[PDB]
């Protein structure tokens, strides 16, 4: 039954609502002009960044890598987020224990990347829960291997905005990424995958009932999980080049 | 012989009297009207069901009474368990042996005596205080509207073999003693007694059904379809694993299906 | 009339035999030696209890734990056979059905260790039919909570078995003490007491025929009725030692 | 409200289990006897000792008993860490207060989850593979012995309390939201927490152990026991340094001890 996988969406996207305070919907609001009163304070340069950080780690180290380490920092908070509307995903907590850890250490990446999207325009993306704006040519800027770290996030989520999802379509496609059956290390694969087949089902009938002029978007949806693997895939190479060629050290454990 | 047997009847029903609250004739003097007490609230639909519940002045609803359904079933384990060391040489047994063979005896013998709880209309529920509709229970969202009809199928056929609480005393005790049960170490000391209870049970039903042909036979072929009943529950359970969110049963019943057939 | 009070005792101790199995003549000559042919088993310390626990739950853990399981055990069926016995007390199974219950579940324990004390003598007490002796000494032994267990059940058992009744006279002081008027819960204590009354006439004139030269026996058999009471109080205060502070559990319903 | 203060007693206890493999329960199975799979070699003397760590085949003894205690308190740290990140608001506080919280809560938690691996007669050491005697350990020369009694003391005291692992989950969280740890710079946002998990922790123990008097009490005043276990511990640190030649602690532990109450 259609009204089945309706009331899954529906369920799906009022979880998605208490994990994620700053949605797809309030930050586009923000990009552009809604209600205009509150608007960010800019980052475009080193001098505003220093204005705007004794404006709000505290200075003590180079630019670059206070804005890599910031990063790092708040990657970890998302984590706690996910892990807590995965919990809401049903199916999930009853799945071995050590398979919801495997599923949530690989999901994970794919969907920060996706969800910063929603942060971002083509000219850069929110930060501290909407509050700043830091260009996306600033973060180009900083010194090599630190230049290169969010350029390949912003190429894709101006490809990925295109497509006008909205959080309820997001609700489904951030559940049908956690629920991949073909993780490294994943004792029981059927019952997951028996899991994300029900949330494809909710999906396709989301995006067929919400965009029925775009067509084929559902297939164009999968696709865009190839193109984020890689997004991943490259930043953990990225990682490497870090982890070998540099001197200062504070990571989150 | 006849004495032995009819002593071992008349045993089993005292016992099962002083560990069953609500017997068969009960629970039919309630459903007919006969009762000279109190008239059990009708639960129908989602209105009354609110007012069912909030009849307390004297979750969502599908868990909810997936939820009071086992609270239900805990007690009438510990009813069974009660009855079961009543039986002769039962406590006598190997103590694995008496573990699973209430592990395997329990749930048939709960489908066995909630038909007397039912007619094709509803179930009586809560000691006799309510009663839910055969459409209520059935309407109910996909998953949980199917744990309910198969029960209902199988009372109303069981329920026109006409059988009374010292039949069913025995008929129980039948169930219990089973030698089939997987992982048994001891399955002849059991088979014995089963045989026992099998000449009992054939002498009751002549001496209590004179004019029912064949009732022994038609009776045994019912444990068949308990059986199947127990098998489709089971893989109703897993349903609830993958459709459901947290789940996780009462730590009894969790005991009771865990590695079950 | 005399005749219809010894044709009650005799039909108590016909009831008795049946019931019971191992009898206080047959434990006598094993506990002394009457036709030495199948000498039990004994048990006399932790080495001898493991070679006769393999000569025989079986081994998974802490051996004064199993012994005192082993107990649990033995005494949920003995209630059976005394629950049996009762059905053929003239009178009680006419009782309303929960009287009959309230009776048993408090005349239980009582009966229990008037008849372990046909098992015992001032060293030991007869297991598993017959088969096995276990020492007194070795009970006595068993780590703290558990070694204070049995030995009351000793001392009341030498002072019990010096009045020496036999099987008939005990036929009629176990359904005394089942008849008892006072115990917590009952409906109607009138008929009870009429049926003890009764009882209580069978075991006097049992007595005076059977022991003429004790004077006063029925006297000393009713006051040991206090000592029992005292028996089952204490043993039930001693199982809430266990219930609080320990960590094994496995127990009957 | 209760459905909220439930939902966080079962997402600590869940993320509890993902955190500590050896966890009471598997450690009271294996004291226990219960287990079925593999028994501890105990280790009671300098003989068997020797046996213990030669049976690699499937410095000095004081010494490279008291390295064995680093590896493993560095591994806890981690596991501890890792239980953290997961007690909700904890990872949103100021990022040199979640440092100052672990610096001071992972020892006192530490000792907590020791007992857990205790009885009176020795402690579960290496997964739960070796069982050293607490007459070994106190037997051991001066300064060396003194580091082991006093945790034991504390154990057996703790443990009559029979926590199970879900009350632990909560009053480990408790342990690590603590407000008074020096140099904090944000302490409400941590109160505040700590009271949530607080009413929860009351929650627990009244619902999991209905017949202990006072039990939310008695534990709170465990607290301090714990404090002073860590004060002892750091006094029985700098006799180490005097009697003892080269000493220098594992890195993370030094970190940990350095500028420490
Ligand atoms: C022995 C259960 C009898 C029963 C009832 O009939 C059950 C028919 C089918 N059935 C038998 C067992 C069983 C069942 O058993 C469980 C607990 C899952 C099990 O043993 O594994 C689960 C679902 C259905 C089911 C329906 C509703 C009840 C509802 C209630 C309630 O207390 C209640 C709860 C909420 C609102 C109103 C009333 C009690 C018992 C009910
Ligand atoms: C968490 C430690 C548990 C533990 C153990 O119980 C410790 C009880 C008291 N205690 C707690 C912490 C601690 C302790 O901690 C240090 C590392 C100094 C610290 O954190 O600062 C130092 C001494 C004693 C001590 C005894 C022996 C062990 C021995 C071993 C071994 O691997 C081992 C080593 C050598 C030979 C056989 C076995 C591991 C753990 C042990």
Redesign the interface.
């Known amino acids: 039954?259609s009204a089945?996988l309706r009331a899954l969406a529906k369920h799906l996207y009022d979880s998605y609502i208490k994990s994620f305070p700053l949605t797809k919907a309030k930050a586009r609001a923000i990009l552009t002009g809604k209600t205009t009163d509150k608007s960010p304070f800019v980052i475009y340069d080193m001098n505003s960044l220093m204005m705007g950080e004794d404006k709000i780690?505290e200075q003590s180290k180079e630019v670059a890598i206070r804005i890599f380490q910031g990063c790092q920092?708040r990657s970890?908070?998302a984590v706690?987020e996910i892990?807590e509307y995965a919990?809401?995903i049903?199916?999930?907590?009853?799945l071995d224990?050590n398979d919801?850890?495997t599923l949530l250490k690989y999901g994970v990446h794919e969907i920060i990347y996706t969800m910063l999207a929603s942060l971002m325009n083509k000219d850069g993306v929110l930060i501290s829960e909407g509050q700043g704006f830091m260009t996306r040519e600033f973060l180009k800027s900083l010194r090599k291997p630190f230049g290169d770290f969010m350029e390949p996030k912003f190429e894709f989520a101006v490809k990925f905005n295109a497509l006008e999802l909205d959080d309820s379509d997001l609700a489904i496609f951030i559940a049908v990424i956690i629920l991949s059956g073909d993780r490294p290390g994943l004792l029981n694969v059927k019952?997951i995958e028996?899991?994300q087949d029900?949330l494809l089902q909710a999906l396709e009938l989301q995006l067929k009932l919400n965009h029925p002029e775009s067509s084929q978007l559902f297939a164009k949806l999968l696709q865009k999980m190839t193109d984020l693997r890689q997004i991943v895939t490259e930043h953990v190479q990225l990682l490497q080049v870090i982890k070998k060629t540099e001197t200062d050290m504070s990571l989150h454990?």
Chains 1, 3 share one sequence.
């Not at 049903?90 to 009853?94: E, L, T």
């Open positions: 039954e089945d780690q920092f970890v908070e706690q892990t919990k809401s049903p199916g999930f907590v009853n224990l919801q850890v019952p028996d899991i029900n454990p």
